């Protein structure tokens, strides 16, 4: 159920960002990830403007490059996993405005590569640190 669960989280988060009509974990994540997204958006502002996410291919490429640079030091923690969702939110927003061929069904592909990255690169750490219910939620819930 690993991949599917993360996929469900990545998908809930972008439906939240795109304001379109979730578990406790997901409600907790949306709230903390969105807070981080706003902070990233203003601080990395000028830098993101000079990149046009005109397609899902570009979005996937940009996501993977950014994620690789972020996690290349081998460090993994809940704070960082939360920024993954924040970044996906930034990408969907840029895609909604810049996607040349507006395919309102590419947002599922985004949730897919977000899940893929998380699963293959932090899945083991997540498990060893309590999973979503006993790791993430315990640490970020009210």
């Amino acid at each position: 159920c690993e991949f599917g669960y993360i996929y469900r989280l990545a998908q809930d988060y972008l439906q939240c960002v795109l304001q379109i009509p979730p578990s406790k974990t997901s409600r907790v994540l949306q709230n903390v990830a969105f807070s981080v997204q706003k902070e990233v958006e203003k601080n990395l502002k000028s830098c993101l403007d000079n990149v046009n996410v005109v397609s899902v291919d570009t979005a996937r490429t940009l996501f993977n490059q950014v994620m690789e640079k972020e996690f290349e030091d081998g460090i993994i923690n809940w704070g960082r996993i939360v920024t993954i969702f924040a970044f996906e939110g930034i990408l969907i927003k840029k895609l909604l405005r810049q996607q040349i061929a507006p395919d309102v069904d590419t947002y599922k592909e985004i949730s897919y590569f977000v899940a893929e990255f998380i699963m293959n690169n932090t899945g083991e750490w997540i498990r060893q640190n309590g999973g979503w219910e006993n790791g993430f939620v315990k640490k970020f819930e009210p």
């Binding site: 830098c47 950014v66 704070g79 960082r80 993954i84 970044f87």
Partner: peptide, 16 residues
């Protein structure tokens, strides 16, 4: 390191 490192910095920031 552009965006990647910034996200790491913010991530470690909200993790603590």
């Amino acid at each position: 390191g552009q965006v990647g490192r910034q996200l790491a910095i913010i991530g470690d920031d909200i993790n603590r």
